[PDB]
Amino acid sequence: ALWQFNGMIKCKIPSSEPLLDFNNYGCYCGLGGSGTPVDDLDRCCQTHDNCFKQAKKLDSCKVLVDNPYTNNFSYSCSNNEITCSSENNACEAFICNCNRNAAICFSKVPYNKEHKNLDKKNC
Ligand SMILES: [Ca+2]
């Protein structure tokens, strides 16, 4: 889910606006992704892309039309830690864990100015 993935990175990074700061960064952070990741932040987004790829080949996710972005799920942010809820059914619980690992990865890697809006001739 986009707005829930947005909310989870703000849980870990209270000062950012993820849809401005982390959209269109490198080769993978954003819509699609291809080529070799340019740094570790970008490698966080490759893994996140691969994890939503996993979820699509899940039998459980198949009947879900509003796919890995508009479909939702439920989680909570409490003292800057993300908890995915047990009332999530199988597809949404896999999506919530994909998104939860991406937001922790984001908070743990250096952010490189030079890669924001990287020319996709580099990917
Ligand atoms: Ca991507």
Curated annotation (Swiss-Prot):
GO terms of biological process kind: antibacterial humoral response; antimicrobial humoral immune response mediated by antimicrobial peptide; arachidonate secretion; defense response to Gram-positive bacterium; fatty acid biosynthetic process; innate immune response in mucosa; lipid catabolic process; phosphatidylcholine metabolic process
Protein name: Phospholipase A2
PTM statement from Swiss-Prot or TrEMBL: Activated by trypsin cleavage in the duodenum. Can also be activated by thrombin or autocatalytically.
Domain of life: Eukaryota
GO cellular component: cell surface; extracellular space
Catalytic activity: a 1,2-diacyl-sn-glycero-3-phosphocholine + H2O = a 1-acyl-sn-glycero-3-phosphocholine + a fatty acid + H(+); 1,2-ditetradecanoyl-sn-glycero-3-phosphocholine + H2O = 1-tetradecanoyl-sn-glycero-3-phosphocholine + tetradecanoate + H(+); 1,2-dihexadecanoyl-sn-glycero-3-phosphocholine + H2O = 1-hexadecanoyl-sn-glycero-3-phosphocholine + hexadecanoate + H(+); 1-hexadecanoyl-2-(9Z-octadecenoyl)-sn-glycero-3-phosphocholine + H2O = 1-hexadecanoyl-sn-glycero-3-phosphocholine + (9Z)-octadecenoate + H(+)
Disulfide bonds: 11-77, 27-123, 29-45, 44-105, 51-98, 61-91, 84-96
Top-rank EC class of the record's enzyme: hydrolase
UniProt-recorded Gene Ontology molecular function terms: bile acid binding; calcium ion binding; calcium-dependent phospholipase A2 activity; phospholipid binding; signaling receptor binding
Localization per record: Secreted
Catalytic residues identified in the record: 48, 99
Keywords: Autocatalytic cleavage, Calcium, Disulfide bond, Hydrolase, Lipid metabolism, Metal-binding, Phospholipid metabolism, Pyrrolidone carboxylic acid, Secreted, Signal, Zymogen
Whole-protein coverage range: 23 to 145 of 145
Subunit details: Monomer or homodimer.
The family this protein is said to belong to: Belongs to the phospholipase A2 family.
Binding-site positions, Ca(2+): 28, 30, 32, 49
Function per UniProt: Secretory calcium-dependent phospholipase A2 that primarily targets dietary phospholipids in the intestinal tract. Hydrolyzes the ester bond of the fatty acyl group attached at sn-2 position of phospholipids (phospholipase A2 activity) with preference for phosphatidylethanolamines and phosphatidylglycerols over phosphatidylcholines. May play a role in the biosynthesis of N-acyl ethanolamines that regulate energy metabolism and inflammation in the intestinal tract.
EC number: 3.1.1.4
Cofactor(s) needed for function: Ca(2+)
Protein encoded by which gene: PLA2G1B
UniProt cofactor note: Binds 1 Ca(2+) ion per subunit.
